[PDB]
Design a protein around this ligand. Structure first.
Ligand SMILES: *[C@@H]1O[C@H](CO)[C@@H](O[C@@H]2O[C@H](CO)[C@@H](O)[C@H](O)[C@H]2NC(C)=O)[C@H](O)[C@H]1NC(C)=O
Ligand SMILES: *[C@@H]1O[C@H](CO)[C@@H](O[C@@H]2O[C@H](CO)[C@@H](O)[C@H](O)[C@H]2NC(C)=O)[C@H](O)[C@H]1NC(C)=O
Ligand SMILES: *[C@@H]1O[C@H](CO)[C@@H](O[C@@H]2O[C@H](CO)[C@@H](O)[C@H](O)[C@H]2NC(C)=O)[C@H](O)[C@H]1NC(C)=O
Ligand SMILES: *[C@@H]1O[C@H](CO)[C@@H](O[C@@H]2O[C@H](CO)[C@@H](O)[C@H](O)[C@H]2NC(C)=O)[C@H](O)[C@H]1NC(C)=O
Ligand SMILES: *[C@@H]1O[C@H](CO)[C@@H](O[C@@H]2O[C@H](CO)[C@@H](O)[C@H](O)[C@H]2NC(C)=O)[C@H](O)[C@H]1NC(C)=O
Ligand SMILES: *[C@@H]1O[C@H](CO)[C@@H](O)[C@H](O)[C@H]1NC(C)=O
Ligand SMILES: *[C@@H]1O[C@H](CO)[C@@H](O)[C@H](O)[C@H]1NC(C)=O
Ligand SMILES: *[C@@H]1O[C@H](CO)[C@@H](O)[C@H](O)[C@H]1NC(C)=O
Ligand SMILES: *[C@@H]1O[C@H](CO)[C@@H](O)[C@H](O)[C@H]1NC(C)=O
Ligand SMILES: *[C@@H]1O[C@H](CO)[C@@H](O)[C@H](O)[C@H]1NC(C)=O
Ligand SMILES: *[C@@H]1O[C@H](CO)[C@@H](O)[C@H](O)[C@H]1NC(C)=O
Lengths: 263, 98, 245, 98, 49
């Protein structure tokens, strides 16, 4: 049903994209609107399938009383229809969430839903939905003649990982497109230089990867060795220094790193 | 029954994860930390210091001795308050800085 | 020597160097324990190399998408090029082959364009790693949060597949205490300011201490300086400045 | 404006006063998160069109994967700028800052 | 013919969004360095703050 106010001349309406989105009946002379029916905007929240088989569903930008109308739930299987209504129906600003129990606490975010709401698989186990926590509340004891001085300290060691290079790949155009067929390869000559161009773009990437490694690692040009007596004031560097009992120059920490990346 | 995820030929807009009220909570915690603690809260726990003493060690860090701050304290505080009012005066005019 | 090198790094973060020499066995023990907890996190079932594995996963996924596009016909009668040349003669076989050429050029052009965009992101990451090798491994940095969280002492590099790991060593201040403080001290109608430190009070007595470690000392004319008179400073406190001679 | 400096071998200039200055800097952090339903844009609600689109392979799976990576990247952009400290400090009731 | 033209319009939109998202990403990395070095510390770098 429509509330569009036409003129006595007109038969149908058009939106921005020039699609017909309203129409007039040629018999009863009434105006009625047209709307698609698919509803693609469905998101499925899961933990692992090695954890559970429970899910929650988010219907995007939809009010929670229009969910069986929007997805046309009466023409669906009964295993879909349990995710259109029920007790676990919760309305966010991202849409309507069905299948999760809304709690009152706040936790650090696990699965982001949107607009401040996260979801977790938490204690029988269930899926819960909460407002997320920014952090622990604090207060400083500010005064105009008070100061805090530290009396001890901690030595801290942390870790930072950075990517340096990627895989150098190469493509032969003619074997991909026209694989050892000379009827096909003579037809490919009429498209010009599309494959001289694609080959030199990949060659400039592969040269750039070796330059990326030089700028990080080859910063000095003296190969320094460490002395055989390890007298460093009590500091012990044996797990990061090279272990000579291997075919490699690798240390103990460097060996734990090369076995945790799956090439 | 206005389902506006259907009215735009497949194009939608997704909401951000942090709201505007959560970003304003983050910037006010960063500002209460600098005013009461200086630079200590960014390297560990927050240690309180009076605000004129904190502005005296920042004068030391640019090469001015700290008596120049304490001997000129009301002049320096009045110059700061007038420059904050000039920021706000030019943002509430029709000149658009963003 | 290594302890004399760790002592001039403590000066670089504002601690006097006698704090390292008086606590040398405790500082070496805290270092040795913290290195041993790096190894227990990498011997674990916690894979923290997610940024390196994501680069490997994105490039394998792109090469598998390019092989699976060879089974599309793009509106031809077949996706196999020998089936077309078996069943048709070159006038109407040329109509079907030009449809397959067009779809396969478009698949290669999409592959190469997104490889160029991904290579620009790897280039910015390796530029940042070249700056951390110069400024955190080859020096001591004052830029806040550039070489860890805390006050930076030193960094160590390790080699990784397609990447680099940095191990940052920092100084974190611990157990803290409340004191009463003042900006200046008035002695002979003159104002006294500390040279490097703060005036603190334990309740009855006034001392001067350095700012990041508590070490109180007697207020003498060798760790203070005089400037002006007492009517100017807001919050000045009456005490004695002892002359050492 | 042109200028000339009065350089000589034994002349120096020393400042006698100062100015406290407050300026402004603006930076973009994030952008709009969009998604496209690739089948509704090309072939919208028609099933003759939907079966002819299957002959082009995984073009709609590949475009949706690229747009989902842009939208996740935007929430990471905001977290690295604003969520730097994990304590939510509140400022004291009495505002005596010298 | 309609499928081929509409596929090319969607591909042009997505390629230019990937290039725009890379300059926003470099801009937010500069903003995160300024929150660390100008708000959480004092900086000696000339004209950084
Ligand atoms: C500073 O902290 C260290 C620990 O980081 C304290 O050392 C501990 O002292 C207790 C009692 O003397 C011992 O039982 C522990 O074995 C020590 N730990 C280590 C790692 O050696 C130290 O006492 C603290 N100093 C002050 C002045 O509080
Ligand atoms: C430095 O630390 C390593 C451990 O990482 C020490 O090596 C251990 O020494 C004990 C001696 O009783 C052996 O039983 C262990 O098997 C050794 N572990 C390894 C992995 O070799 C080493 O002794 C320390 N260095 C110094 C000088 O104390
Ligand atoms: C503040 O520090 C001073 C100096 O260390 C303390 O004065 C000493 O107090 C002890 C009492 O345990 C006496 O035996 C010493 O003779 C005092 N020294 C001097 C030089 O007078 C003072 O007690 C401390 N005050 C507080 C509240 O801890
Ligand atoms: C610090 O000591 C001086 C004395 O040297 C105090 O100055 C006196 O202040 C009172 C109050 O007006 C006057 O009646 C005296 O004439 C002053 N004496 C001198 C010698 O000028 C001063 O008040 C003390 N400061 C504090 C904070 O108590
Ligand atoms: C340093 O500059 C300030 C201006 O920033 C001067 O203060 C001004 O002095 C004039 C004349 O006394 C007054 O009309 C203004 O109202 C003052 N401004 C403020 C903010 O108080 C100050 O006098 C200068 N110092 C010297 C030594 O000349
Ligand atoms: C056509 O017939 C219907 C009745 O079924 C009527 O409502 C409509 O006005 C008619 N149109 C004419 C007479 O033009
Ligand atoms: C998936 O399987 C592994 C091995 O059994 C287990 O460690 C992991 O925790 C499983 N998922 C969950 C959360 O049950
Ligand atoms: C959360 O608290 C509100 C306010 O007291 C209450 O109305 C609501 O029922 C609570 N929800 C749960 C799940 O406890
Ligand atoms: C310092 O004093 C305040 C106010 O009495 C108190 O809240 C705070 O815990 C004290 N700090 C320490 C380190 O004892
Ligand atoms: C601090 O405030 C108190 C009142 O709470 C006041 O008596 C004192 O003079 C002030 N000190 C300074 C240095 O402003
Ligand atoms: C400085 O300049 C004067 C005047 O030109 C010159 O005569 C004098 O020798 C110079 N002094 C030095 C630094 O030699």
């Amino acid at each position: 049903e429509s509330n569009k106010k036409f003129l006595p001349f007109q038969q149908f309406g058009r939106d921005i994209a020039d699609t017909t989105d309203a129409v007039r009946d040629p018999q009863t002379l009434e105006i009625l609107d047209i709307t698609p029916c698919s509803f693609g905007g469905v998101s499925v929240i899961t933990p692992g399938t090695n954890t559970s088989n429970q899910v929650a569903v988010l219907y995007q930008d939809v009010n929670c009383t229009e969910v069986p109308v929007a997805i046309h739930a009466d023409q669906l299987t009964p295993t879909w229809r349990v995710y259109s209504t029920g007790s676990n129906v919760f309305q966010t600003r991202a849409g309507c969430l069905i299948g999760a129990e809304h709690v009152n606490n706040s936790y650090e975010c696990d699965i982001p839903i949107g607009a401040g709401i996260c979801a977790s698989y938490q204690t029988s186990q269930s899926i819960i939905a909460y407002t997320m926590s920014l952090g622990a509340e604090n207060s400083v004891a500010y005064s105009n003649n008070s100061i805090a001085i530290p009396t001890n300290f901690t030595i801290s060691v942390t870790t930072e990982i950075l990517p340096v290079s990627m895989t150098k790949t190469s493509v032969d155009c003619t074997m991909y497109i026209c694989g050892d067929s000379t009827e096909c390869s003579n037809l490919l000559l009429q498209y010009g230089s599309f494959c001289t161009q694609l080959n030199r773009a990949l060659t400039g990437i592969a040269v750039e990867q070796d330059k990326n490694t030089q700028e990080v690692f080859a910063q000095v040009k003296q190969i320094y060795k460490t002395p055989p007596i390890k007298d460093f004031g009590g500091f012990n560097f044996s797990q990061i220094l090279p272990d000579p009992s291997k075919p490699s120059k690798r240390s103990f920490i460097e060996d734990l790193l090369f076995n945790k990346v799956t090439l | 029954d206005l389902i506006c995820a259907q009215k735009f030929n497949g194009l939608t807009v997704l909401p951000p994860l942090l709201t505007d009220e959560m970003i304003a909570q983050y910037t006010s915690a960063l500002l209460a930390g600098t005013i009461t603690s200086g630079w200590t809260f960014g390297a560990g726990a927050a240690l309180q210091i009076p605000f004129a003493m904190q502005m005296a060690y920042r004068f030391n860090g640019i090469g001015v001795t700290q008596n120049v701050l304490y001997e000129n304290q009301k002049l320096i505080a009045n110059q700061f308050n007038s420059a904050i009012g000039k920021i706000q005066d030019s943002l509430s005019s029709t000149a658009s800085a963003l | 020597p290594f302890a004399m090198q760790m002592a001039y790094r403590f000066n670089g973060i504002g601690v006097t160097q006698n704090v390292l020499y008086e606590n040398q066995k405790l500082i070496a023990n805290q270092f040795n324990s913290a290195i041993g907890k790096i190894q227990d996190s990498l011997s674990s079932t916690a894979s923290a190399l997610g940024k390196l594995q994501d680069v490997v996963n994105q490039n394998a996924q792109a090469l598998n998408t390019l092989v699976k596009q060879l089974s599309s016909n793009f509106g031809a009668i077949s996706s196999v090029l020998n089936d077309i040349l078996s069943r048709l003669d070159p006038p109407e076989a040329e109509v079907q082959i030009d449809r397959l050429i067009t779809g396969r050029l478009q698949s290669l052009q999409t592959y190469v364009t997104q490889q160029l965009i991904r290579a620009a992101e790897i280039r910015a990451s390796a530029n940042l790693a070249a700056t951390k090798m110069s400024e955190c491994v080859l020096g001591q940095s004052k830029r806040v949060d550039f070489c860890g969280k805390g006050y930076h002492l030193m960094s160590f590099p390790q080699s990784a597949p397609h990447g680099v790991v940095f191990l940052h060593v920092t100084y974190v201040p611990a157990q803290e205490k409340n004191f009463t403080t003042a900006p200046a001290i008035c002695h002979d109608g003159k104002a006294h300011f500390p040279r490097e430190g703060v005036f603190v009070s334990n309740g009855t007595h006034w001392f001067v201490t350095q700012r990041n470690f508590y070490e109180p000392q007697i207020i003498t004319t060798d760790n203070t300086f005089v400037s002006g008179n007492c009517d100017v400073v807001i919050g000045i406190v009456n005490n004695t400045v002892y002359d050492p001679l």
